[PDB]
Each structure stands twice: as structure tokens, then as C-alpha cells.
Amino acid sequence: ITSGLKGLHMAAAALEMVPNIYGFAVGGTRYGAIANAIAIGGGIAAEG
Amino acid sequence: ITSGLKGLHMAAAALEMVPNIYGFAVGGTRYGAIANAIAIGGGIAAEG
Amino acid sequence: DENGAQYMQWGAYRIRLNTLFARQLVERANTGIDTILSMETQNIQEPMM
Amino acid sequence: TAISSEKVQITIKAGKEYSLTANKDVSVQPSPSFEEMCYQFNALEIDGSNLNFTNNSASIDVTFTALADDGRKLGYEIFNIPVIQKVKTDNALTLFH
Amino acid sequence: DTTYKNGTFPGLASARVIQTVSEPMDFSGANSLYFWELFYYTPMMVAQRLLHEQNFDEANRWLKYVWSPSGYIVRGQIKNYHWNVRPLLENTSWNSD
Amino acid sequence: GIGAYIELILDKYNPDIHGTNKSFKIIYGDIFKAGDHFPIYQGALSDITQTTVKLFLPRVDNAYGNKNNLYVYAAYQKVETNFIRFVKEDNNKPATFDTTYKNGTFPGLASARVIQTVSEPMDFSGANSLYFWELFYYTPMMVAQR
Amino acid sequence: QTKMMDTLLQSVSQSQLNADTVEDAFKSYLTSFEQVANLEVISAYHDNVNNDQGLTYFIGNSKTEVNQYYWRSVDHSKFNDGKFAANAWSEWHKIDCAINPYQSTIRPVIYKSRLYLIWLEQKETAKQKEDNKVTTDYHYELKLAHIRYDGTWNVPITFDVDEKILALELTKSQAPGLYCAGYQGEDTLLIMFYRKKEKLDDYKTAPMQGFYIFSDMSSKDMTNEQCNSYRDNGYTHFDTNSDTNSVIRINNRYAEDYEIPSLINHSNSHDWGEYNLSQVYGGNIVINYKVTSNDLKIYISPKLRIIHDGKEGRERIQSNLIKKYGKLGDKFIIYTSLGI
Amino acid sequence: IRYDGTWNVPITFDVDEKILALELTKSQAPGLYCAGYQGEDTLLIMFY
Numbered sequence A, B: 001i002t003s004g005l006k007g008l009h010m011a012a013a014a015l016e017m018v019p020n021i022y023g024f025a026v027g028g029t030r031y032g033a034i035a036n037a038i039a040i041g042g043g044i045a046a047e048g
Numbered sequence C: 001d002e003n004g005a006q007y008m009q010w011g012a013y014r015i016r017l018n019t020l021f022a023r024q025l026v027e028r029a030n031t032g033i034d035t036i037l038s039m040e041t042q043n044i045q046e047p048m049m
Numbered sequence D: 001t002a003i004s005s006e007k008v009q010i011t012i013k014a015g016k017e018y019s020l021t022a023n024k025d026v027s028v029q030p031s032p033s034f035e036e037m038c039y040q041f042n043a044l045e046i047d048g049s050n051l052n053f054t055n056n057s058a059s060i061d062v063t064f065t066a067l068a069d070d071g072r073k074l075g076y077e078i079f080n081i082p083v084i085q086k087v088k089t090d091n092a093l094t095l096f097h
Numbered sequence E: 001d002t003t004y005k006n007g008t009f010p011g012l013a014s015a016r017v018i019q020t021v022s023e024p025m026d027f028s029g030a031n032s033l034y035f036w037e038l039f040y041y042t043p044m045m046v047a048q049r050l051l052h053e054q055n056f057d058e059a060n061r062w063l064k065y066v067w068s069p070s071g072y073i074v075r076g077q078i079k080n081y082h083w084n085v086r087p088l089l090e091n092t093s094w095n096s097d
Numbered sequence F: 001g002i003g004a005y006i007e008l009i010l011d012k013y014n015p016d017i018h019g020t021n022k023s024f025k026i027i028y029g030d031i032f033k034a035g036d037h038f039p040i041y042q043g044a045l046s047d048i049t050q051t052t053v054k055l056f057l058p059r060v061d062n063a064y065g066n067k068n069n070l071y072v073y074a075a076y077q078k079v080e081t082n083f084i085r086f087v088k089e090d091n092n093k094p095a096t097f098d099t100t101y102k103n104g105t106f107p108g109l110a111s112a113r114v115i116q117t118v119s120e121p122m123d124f125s126g127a128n129s130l131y132f133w134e135l136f137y138y139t140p141m142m143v144a145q146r
Numbered sequence G: 001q002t003k004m005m006d007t008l009l010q011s012v013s014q015s016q017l018n019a020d021t022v023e024d025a026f027k028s029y030l031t032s033f034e035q036v037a038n039l040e041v042i043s044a045y046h047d048n049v050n051n052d053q054g055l056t057y058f059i060g061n062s063k064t065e066v067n068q069y070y071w072r073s074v075d076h077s078k079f080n081d082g083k084f085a086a087n088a089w090s091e092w093h094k095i096d097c098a099i100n101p102y103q104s105t106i107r108p109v110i111y112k113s114r115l116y117l118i119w120l121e122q123k124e125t126a127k128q129k130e131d132n133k134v135t136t137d138y139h140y141e142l143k144l145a146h147i148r149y150d151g152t153w154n155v156p157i158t159f160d161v162d163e164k165i166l167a168l169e170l171t172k173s174q175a176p177g178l179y180c181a182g183y184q185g186e187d188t189l190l191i192m193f194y195r196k197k198e199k200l201d202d203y204k205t206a207p208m209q210g211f212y213i214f215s216d217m218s219s220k221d222m223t224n225e226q227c228n229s230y231r232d233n234g235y236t237h238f239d240t241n242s243d244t245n246s247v248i249r250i251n252n253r254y255a256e257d258y259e260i261p262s263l264i265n266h267s268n269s270h271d272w273g274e275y276n277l278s279q280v281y282g283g284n285i286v287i288n289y290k291v292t293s294n295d296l297k298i299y300i301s302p303k304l305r306i307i308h309d310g311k312e313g314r315e316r317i318q319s320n321l322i323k324k325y326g327k328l329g330d331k332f333i334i335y336t337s338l339g340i
Numbered sequence H: 001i002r003y004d005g006t007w008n009v010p011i012t013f014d015v016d017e018k019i020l021a022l023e024l025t026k027s028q029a030p031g032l033y034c035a036g037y038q039g040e041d042t043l044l045i046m047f048y
Helices: A006-015 A033-047 B006-015 B033-047 C021-028 E032-052 E056-063 F129-145 G003-011 G019-037 G162-167 G200-204 G224-233 G314-324 H016-021
Strands: C007-010 C013-016 D008-014 D037-040 D044-047 D057-067 D073-085 F003-009 F023-026 F041-044 F052-058 F074-076 G040-046 G055-061 G070-075 G106-111 G114-125 G137-146 G157-160 G177-181 G189-194 G209-213 G219-221 G284-292 G295-307 H032-035 H044-047
Touching (some): A006 A033, A033 B006, B006 B033, D008 D044, D008 G295, D057 G295, D073 G284, F041 F052, F129 G003, G003 G019, G040 G106, G055 G106, G106 G177, G114 G177, G137 G162, G189 G224, G200 G224
Antiparallel strands (some): C007 C013, D008 D057, D037 G295, D044 G295, D057 D073, G040 G055, G055 G070, G106 G114, G114 G137, G137 G157, G177 G189, G189 G209, G209 G219, G284 G295, H032 H044
């Protein structure tokens, strides 16, 4: 069930790249979702 | 595999300094990504 | 310095503070531990102060 | 123990021997000492022709040697300098998806 | 400074090297502790720890990185030196008191 | 890519023709320049006509000799000389022999063959070969030992 | 052994083994095999100046989202008889630093005998155009990251290159070409940007954007009279307009007509003299070469050195005795057969 | 799906052009048709 769950984190990290504030203020996206997901995957592999 | 993974967190912390909201609203960046990454590195060293 | 050295001019004295050993260690460290611990690695030179 | 500058000589092998002698090529004679006798030589031209290239590579050996005045030798120290040549007729490697 | 000896040589003998740019590294400078911990203390500690775990030939080849009684061979040629750490060849007190 | 699989069965070892050695080299020639290429296959001879070598054969679509696009000869110790060749169409229809009545002579050569093959069986010598060995052999061995 | 077989063995490393447990472990191993069997090569880099020798590094792609780029190496020296022997290849290795290129524009490079990955990365911004509206802009940044000794990856270095990419005349949704090569004499990481053309010979005329990277990771921009030499020397390694079934090429290390090292200090062979009394040792050659046609002008300055030391035993101590009291030029009688 | 039973990260496709091509009111999903095809292996998809 640890399942390579880092794929499931990287699903969220890839899903959060797009800018969400629209209208006048443009942007607002996270940029470091990717490396944060790689970090939590590197932790979860050690726990497994 | 704990690898000095705090380098991998600091990659994200350095990658998230820039302001992402553009247009009229300028700024919106986190400022405490650095110390938060140093914190999670200090935790991960103790776990190792 | 231009070539990569750093030193403190303590009056008439120049004393070195850093070294370029890790720069030129990379080539020696390519092929194995045996090359790293040689006498040849120990004679890598450092530029003029 | 006497060491003549005439019998401190160099040959280099790049196609032919280009025999060189310290007596005309040392700028200033080093002082007589058993510890170190450092011979500094001059600018020495090497003609690039007569170098055969197998696998687009050539090598130039330098032979340091020294001879005592009685006729015995002080020892030699042979070096080796590779010469590698870039061709033009070969194109770069493509990846063909 | 050239007139015919501006500087006299009452206890002095000669003046020398013009041509050297870089110097060999120092085991007495600022970073010297890291050089000692790299070259001497590391193979000693590895060899001691391998000796206590009854693994013998690996401990022997780790001791040979420091003191080979049989001499060292580098690329076919037997080398002159007999110790592998350079400030062991030349005693250098890196702690005054 | 584009090219052909061809197979050249070779004649029996007569040292009258093959020289003192059973060693030979088939060769490639005449692409990318007017010079000489090197060993698309190397093997050895036998008293039986045993040498039958199925070879892939690469083709630039525009060869310099447009009359007949590709050339192969076979070298060995005694005689290593220049022959005449094959030709592929620019069509997907594969190559024939360069047809006058034998442009290319067959001094140690015997015949020319397969036109119709597209895909080849996989290689256990290529880049991914270690993964194929670890799949097929090392895995059931390790499971069975454990 | 790969880590695939490792995690298989770890999956079957217990006492109570049922057949279906073995089956599930085998299915997990099969998925891990599926992941690296579908690898696609983005780009590559050749080590040596010419194609017959040296190594070659590939960069792998998966068929997934945010990618786990892989790399492997292969030698050209073990080539014979039309095929690499299977020991000339290497295993795939995983890259850990978070990489997000644009249009898969990434090349490896071997700078100072260390693997460096360099890639282009694109961030969307939005300026205020406001007479009425808010315009949308892109800016391009350059990243550079290198491996460590144990196998981990450093934090990448930022460079702002929006000026030079804006200098090139580029449409949207088309990545500029990237050229990146090492350079032995005057160790400096070359980099050149270029618009993609259809013909190689068009790049002899295309103006160039690029700079230099020194040992301190500091930049220095190219003057075009200096870049003309590099463009005239390496115009064949550029890439065409790369659609599918179009031409993408590899890069060698940069050199002009001859490649010569600057200094030798290590000996290739040396020898004792007669009677083991002294030896010639510690020499060195600096090399200055000038490149011109149908010849080569190598200028060396060998600095010979004679020492006086004996072999260990009686010879070193007789060398010390003859070093102390006698001066250079005298005659001596030494005794070989010394017994008790 | 993968072999062991886990799910891959999904693939993005932008289809706002084609859904805007269909003449749709709000709060009504367009129909979706999706079928396999053996000869000339190619995943069919049709909006309507």
C-alpha cells in the first residue's frame, strides 16, 4: 500500500502547476510543487 | 536514500522565492521557505 | 586573486586562506580510490599568492 | 662526479630525432650542488609534419638523459606527449527517431 | 640588482629560481587538519575497524595505502618512495605546543 | 529505418582460393564518401559451406552512386578485391541484385536472398540486454533458490 | 545487479512463502521493468573530439508526466565488428533534481570531467499593458546542475537569459536550439543559442547568442568577432528544424584543427643510472602550439632536473656521505662489496 | 492501470476548441464516444 505512492503525490504536483488567479492579477501558481513532491517521495521510500 | 535530502528540500525553497502574482498585484511570494526547509532538514537528520 | 587564490595581507605577510584542491581533485578522483590516495595526488600544486 | 653541460642532452621523436644539447640551450648554468641541478631550456620548435595518425592519434616522446664525464650514465627519464587530430569528413552523429 | 654585486654575499652564496608559478600544497596551513584526516586518519580507522571484524585481506590492502613494505608500483613502474603520505617523508610539526 | 536484411551464403573453404587462412572479413564500402568501411561482419571459413550470414544493410535514401545504391565485397587473407554490387529501389519494395548477368561476380560468394522480412527477432546482445537476462534467467533462478 | 532485482529479492526475503505472494512480487517487478523498458532518448553528448573513441552519455525520457529523467553511458573503445559488445553499455541511472524543461531542451555536458546537465526553463509572466488590458509575457531562464561523487545532484544555478532569447527572432511554441561543449585548453564551458534553420549551411550566416562559463560559474558574453571562430569551426554540429522524422544531432567536445595538452608533470617512465647513485627526475614540459595549415608549430620548454640520491640500503647512505664532505666535480672511490 | 493494480498519472489534453465548436448550453455535458479499433490500433474518440 506504499504502492509507489510518490506517483500519487506527483499527480497533485503536476495538477497544481497552472495559474489559478484569473482576471487582472495573473499567475499565483506555485512553482516548487514538483521538488516538494520529489522530497516527500524520497521520505516515503525510506519509510517503506 | 536519506541522501542529504535536505538539499532536495532546499531546491524547492530556493525555487519558490520569486513573486508569482503578476500584473497589478505584485509580490505574493513566500519569504519563509528557507527557514522552513532548514527546519525540515534538521528533522530529517535526526531521523537518519 | 585573479587565478583563484585568496590571502590576507597582514602587513608584509601574505597568508593563504583557501585552496583549489577540490577543483583539481575531480580529475584524479575519476577512476578509483587508488588514484586518490597516491603520492601523485599529494603533489598537486596551488597557485601563487 | 663532474657533470658537463655537453653531456646533458635531449632527443625528441616526432618522425625523426631532433637531438638537442644543453650547452647551447641553457640560458644560465645552474650552480654545482648535489641537491638540485635545474636546467632551463629555450623555445624549441617542433615541425608538425611527419606525424603518422593511427586512430587519428600521434605521440611525441621526449627522452631526458644525462651522462657523467667518465662515460657512465646518470639515468634517463622518458616522457610521452599525445597528439590527437580532428577530421572534417565525418559528420556529427544523428539520432533518427 | 645588477651592478657587479650591489648586494655583497658575506654569508650568502647564490640567487636562483626564476621560473616557478605554483607551489606544492602545505600540511601546515589553514586547511591542514582536513588533509591529515583525509590521508592518514581515514585509512587507519578503516583498517582498524576491518581488523576488529576478522576481515583480513581488505584490512591489508587498506594498510597498503599508507605504508607498503614491498614498494609501490604505478603503471608498470616500481616507484622510489616507501611511505605513501608526504609529511611522513618530511617531518613537519603542525602543532607547536 | 530504411534498409534491407540480406543473407550471403559463402562458398566452401578451398585454400586454393581462400588463401592459407580460414579467417575472412565481409566488408562494407561506398557510402558517405568514396572511401572504405569496415566490418559489418567478421567470421571464419569451413569445409562445409557453413558461412551463411543474415545481415541488416543500412541505406541513405540518396546514394552517391545512383546507378546502384549499395556495395558489399568480401575480403580475406589472399584476395580482398573489388566486386560489383546490389541496388535497392527508392520504393518500400526491397532490393534485388544489380542485374546485368552478374555485374557482381561470385568468387567465394554463392547466392543472394531474402527480400521479404520487415522486423527482426530481439537481441540479447544490444543495449537493453541486461534487463532481458535479469527477466528471463536470473528471476526464476533466484525465486527457485529462495 | 540493478535495484529491480534488489527490490524483488527484498520482496521475497521472508520465511513463510506462499505461491501467490511470489506472484504478487513478480507483478511488482514486472511493473518496475515496464517503467524502464519504454525509455526514449531526448538528447546526448559525445565525450571525445572524434567519434571513434571516448564515451557517450544519453538522457532518457519516460512516457509519464513530470519526468524522471534517466541517463546511461556507453564506450566507443569496446566497439568491434559492427556492434557494441554488451559490456560496453551501462545501466540506466536516475536523476533526482527537479527538472522541468521547455520543449525538452536539455543536453548533458562533461565540464572538468564531471557530468553537468544544462537545460532551458520558461516562466510565464504578465506585464501591465494598460491602456485597457493586461498583457502576457514569457521570460526564459537557464539552469545548470551537476552530479556529486556519491551520485546525488546539486541545487541548480540560476541564469537570466531573457535578453539573449529575445535577441533571437523566435516565434511562439518553437524552442531555440542549444549548443553546449567542453573545451580543454582554456577550461571554459561553451554555450551558444541559435534559431533552428532547415539547412546546416544556413548556420554559417546565422548570428549567434551565447556566453562563457568559467570555474566560478560566472558568465561572460560572446563578442561576435570571437564567436565567428567557434561558428566556423563547429557549424556542422548544429541541428535542423526538428519535427518528427527530422534531424537532431549530437555534440562533441570543442576543439579546432589540433588538440594538445598544455603541461605534463607526471613521468611516463624513468630509471636509475649506473650504480644507483643518482637519477634524473622531476622534469616537466610546458607546451605552446600555433595552428596553421599543412603543419603545426609546437613550442616546448623542457626543464630538466638532476638529483643525487641513492637506492635504499648502502647506496642512500653512501650518497649522503658523498653529499656532505665532497663537492661537485671531485673524484671518489666507493666500495660495493661490504660484508661483515 | 498498471500491472500490479496501480494507476498512472493522467495525461492532459486541451479540448476547449472542440467543445466550443459544439453548440452547447450551460449545465449540459456533451456526449462522449470512445472505442477501440484492432486493425490500425488507434484509440477512437468522438464528441457530440
